């Protein structure tokens, strides 16, 4: 008797603002197994003045991951998640008009002054639920059109990043709700495009693809790619929303990120679109099964990094272990800076900027290095603690635990700090969060798992949860 072979699976593509990964996951003895099979950089380029996404490189890496996936697994589907807000414009013959612009592009700096002239910001808030930010898709489209109206007439379709890569693979247009709710074009109540806002900003609805929900089977990968007719599935296409899939669905649970997309929030059954929620800086995005991911952006673990790269330029390079020791040791109570209100510019030196801010707004001393690190760490921790206190007031509920999702292998100590200042259990072990949520969505769609029912029992089996509790000092 001659022996034969291979294993059924689902391919998750997780594109981030700085790096991308391809992760395979499959059922193996009714347990979820997940193998990372490709990882890469996502280096932006400057194109005709604008910061832009290298789309030809990204698509190349997606195809290289699928060929690698087909090599070791039977792939039943692929499913792509990305960062929010950015989009590509497709002309009338189905070609990319230009390279998608990076959310950090200076085109939107100053843009809210023009929006304020055409609508009160709270009204826009009450129709879309998003905290009003310059990077939001609406204002990006507003600038892009304003900067070159004649150019802009050539757009036939506007594709958010996941829809762009989905279009490139399949030829077909769809925008899934989770990415649509980062745009300031989408109504979290009806969970579809907001025609009132479209009317106001004079954008024809035809420009936007049809709204779909997660699990939608869009189409198969085009025959000319040579990869086979693999179904492409619309997953929770915004990376944040895929990560929230894997958070337990228990009453008193919050989630937190300190990387990339730093935030704190909770899943709600329906949006909060009050002046309170508006004035308090909260956003209503949409996630799996139409839930509201109700959340407040914070500024994340990045000012630490920048103060590190600023200590390298002074020939004193610290490791996080150095930083932990340095901060853990400095036991005084130092000033607390309102990190949210800081305006530290793009290519400044962080040591000097922070020294300066402190001198202007608190007091003066030759701040030793551990002390600037302590102040920075305590201030970001306090930003999160205040964020939760508003979250509790607005939601009429007190919560008990906080799952760490997203970026922050570097953040482990920041997590224990979060526990110290908030009084809540902090759980970690969810660094695969996004890929898990991406994968299960596809497994349900191809019928490997029954529903969220089983999916929860399968994720919880998979996760190795570790708790942090408030320590004195």
Task: State the residue for tokens 């908030």.
Answer: 422
- Pair type for strands 192-193 and 186-187: antiparallel
Work out how many domains the chain is built from and give that number: 2
Asked if residue 431 and residue 321 are part of one domain, the reply reads: yes
Spatial separation of the C-alpha atoms in residues 160 and 281, rounded to whole Å: 24
Instruction: Determine the straight-line distance between the first and last CA of the chain, rounded to whole angstroms.
Output: 69
Degrees (nearest 5) of the Cα angle 67, 72, 77?
65
Asked if residue 299 and residue 218 are part of one domain, the reply reads: no
Structural domain ending residue among the three candidates 201, 220, 238: 238
Asked if residue 164 and residue 266 are part of one domain, the reply reads: no
Asked if residue 270 and residue 208 are part of one domain, the reply reads: no
Asked if residue 98 and residue 35 are part of one domain, the reply reads: yes
Specify the 3-state DSSP secondary structure of 41: strand
H or E stretch including 68?
A: helix 55-72
Q: What is the DSSP letter of 225?
A: G
Asked if residue 222 and residue 201 are part of one domain, the reply reads: yes
DSSP 162-223: HHHHHHHHHS---EEHHHHTTTTSEETTTTEE-HHHHHHHT--GGGSPPEE-TT-EEEE--G
Task: State the residue for tokens 């407040």.
Answer: 296
Asked if residue 439 and residue 396 are part of one domain, the reply reads: yes
Structural domain ending residue among the three candidates 206, 238, 270: 238
Query: Which residues belong to the active site?
Result: 239
Asked if residue 156 and residue 250 are part of one domain, the reply reads: no
With beta carbons less than 8 A apart as the criterion, state whether 179 and 160 touch: yes
Asked if residue 136 and residue 33 are part of one domain, the reply reads: yes
Asked if residue 158 and residue 179 are part of one domain, the reply reads: yes
Task: Report which of 393, 403, 466, 463 is spatially closest to residue 435, judged by C-alpha positions.
Answer: 463
Q: What is the DSSP letter of 470?
A: P
Whichever domain contains 410, its CATH number is 3.30.420.40
Task: Report which of 326, 439, 451, 453 is spatially closest to residue 81, judged by C-alpha positions.
Answer: 439
Angstrom CA distances, 11 to 49, 72, 126, 218, 350, stand at 35, 11, 37, 15, 41
Asked if residue 351 and residue 336 are part of one domain, the reply reads: yes
Asked if residue 248 and residue 215 are part of one domain, the reply reads: no
Q: How was this structure determined?
A: X-ray
Q: Which domain holds residue 288?
A: 239-473
**Phi-psi category of 185—alpha, beta or left, where left has phi over 0 and alpha has psi -120 to 50?**
alpha
With beta carbons less than 8 A apart as the criterion, state whether 110 and 123 touch: no
Structural domain ending residue among the three candidates 209, 238, 267: 238
Q: What are phi and psi of 239, to 5 degrees?
A: -55, -45
* C-alpha torsion angle, residues 85, 90, 95, 97 (rounded to 10): -80
- Resolution of the determined structure in angstroms stands at 2.0
């Amino acid at each position: 008797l001659v022996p034969r072979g291979s294993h059924e699976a689902v391919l998750a593509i997780d594109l981030g603002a700085t790096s991308g990964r391809a992760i395979v996951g499959y059922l193996s003895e009714n347990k979820l197994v997940m193998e990372e099979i490709n990882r890469f950089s996502n280096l932006p380029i400057r194109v005709k003045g604008h910061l832009s996404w290298d789309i030809d490189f990204l698509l190349a890496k997606i195809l290289e991951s699928i060929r690698l996936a087909n090599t070791s697994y039977k792939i039943l589907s692929i499913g792509i998640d990305t960062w929010g807000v950015d989009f590509g414009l497709i002309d009338n013959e189905g070609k990319l008009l230009l390279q998608p612009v990076h959310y950090r592009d200076e085109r939107t700096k100053g843009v809210l002054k023009e929006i304020s002239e055409m609508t009160e910001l709270e009204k826009l808030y009450s129709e879309t639920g998003n905290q009003i930010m310059e990077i939001n898709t609406l204002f990006q489209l507003f600038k892009a059109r304003q900067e070159s109206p004649d150019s802009f007439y050539k757009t036939n379709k506007i594709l958010l990043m996941p829809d762009l890569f989905n279009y490139l693979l399949t030829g077909k247009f769809a925008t899934e709700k989770s990415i649509a709710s980062t745009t300031q074009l989408f109504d979290p109540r009806s969970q579809n495009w907001n025609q009132n806002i479209l009317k106001l900003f004079e954008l024809d609805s035809s420009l936007l693809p049809e709204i779909v929900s997660e699990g939608n089977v869009l189409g198969r990968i085009k025959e000319e790619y040579g990869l086979g007719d693999i179904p492409v599935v619309n997953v929770c296409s915004h990376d944040t929303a895929s990560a929230i899939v894997s958070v337990p669905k228990t009453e008193g649970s919050l989630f937190i990120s300190s990387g990339t997309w730093s935030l704190v929030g909770v899943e709600l059954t329906s949006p909060i679109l009050t002046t309170e929620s508006f004035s308090y800086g909260f956003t209503n995005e949409v996630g799996k099964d139409g839930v509201i991911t109700f959340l407040k952006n914070c500024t994340g673990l990045w000012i630490i990094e920048e103060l590190r790269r600023s200590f390298e330029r002074r020939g004193k390079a610290y490791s996080f272990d150095d930083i932990r020791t340095m901060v853990e040791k400095e036991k005084e109570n130092l000033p607390l800076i309102d990190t949210e209100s800081t305006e530290f510019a793009t290519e400044s030196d962080m040591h000097k900027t922070l020294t300066e801010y402190l001198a202007y707004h608190h007091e003066t001393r030759e701040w030793t290095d551990g002390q600037l690190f302590k102040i920075v760490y305590e201030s970001l921790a306090e930003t999160y603690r205040k964020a939760i206190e508003l979250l509790e007031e607005l939601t009429h509920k007190v919560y008990k635990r906080i799952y760490v999702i997203g970026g922050g292998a570097r953040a482990s100590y920041f997590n224990q700090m979060i526990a110290d200042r908030t009084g809540k259990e902090v759980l970690t072990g969810l660094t695969e969060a996004t890929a898990v949520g991406n994968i299960v969505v596809q497994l349900i769609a191809m019928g490997q798992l029954k529903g969220m029912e089983e999916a929860h029992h399968v994720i919880e089996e998979f996760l190795q949860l570790e708790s942090y509790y408030s320590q004195k000092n």
